[PDB]
Design a protein around this nucleic acid. Sequence first.
DNA 1: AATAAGCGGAAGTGGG
DNA 2: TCCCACTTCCGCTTA
Length: 91
Amino acid sequence: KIRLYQFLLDLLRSGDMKDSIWWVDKDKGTFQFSSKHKEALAHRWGIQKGNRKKMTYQKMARALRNYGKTGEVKKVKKKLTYQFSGEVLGR
DNA sequence: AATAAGCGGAAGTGGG
DNA sequence: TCCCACTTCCGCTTA
Ligand code: NA
């Protein structure tokens, strides 16, 4: 199964949910979710994974926080904003 | 209060 | 056995 960080990077590359997620500074790998439209993106993640329950943005962000220690995605001190690592961006 | 983002410990599920 | 990569649940903090 695709990993969450890859799901998000693929959405940013394809532009399929441009009203739910966007680059802030693509060169730095910073991206931001829509306050009003992030739930639709979370729903898509859960359906892609085949999870038992409906996915919510809260649960998706709970998973995102676990990448902080290994570095694939870090939280930025701006609303709904995160940053991919250079390794993730280069792969 | 109502609303929202952010946090993480703990236990459960998947597929190795 | 026991880690992977989350998922689910719950309670708390700050604005
Ligand atoms: Na929120």
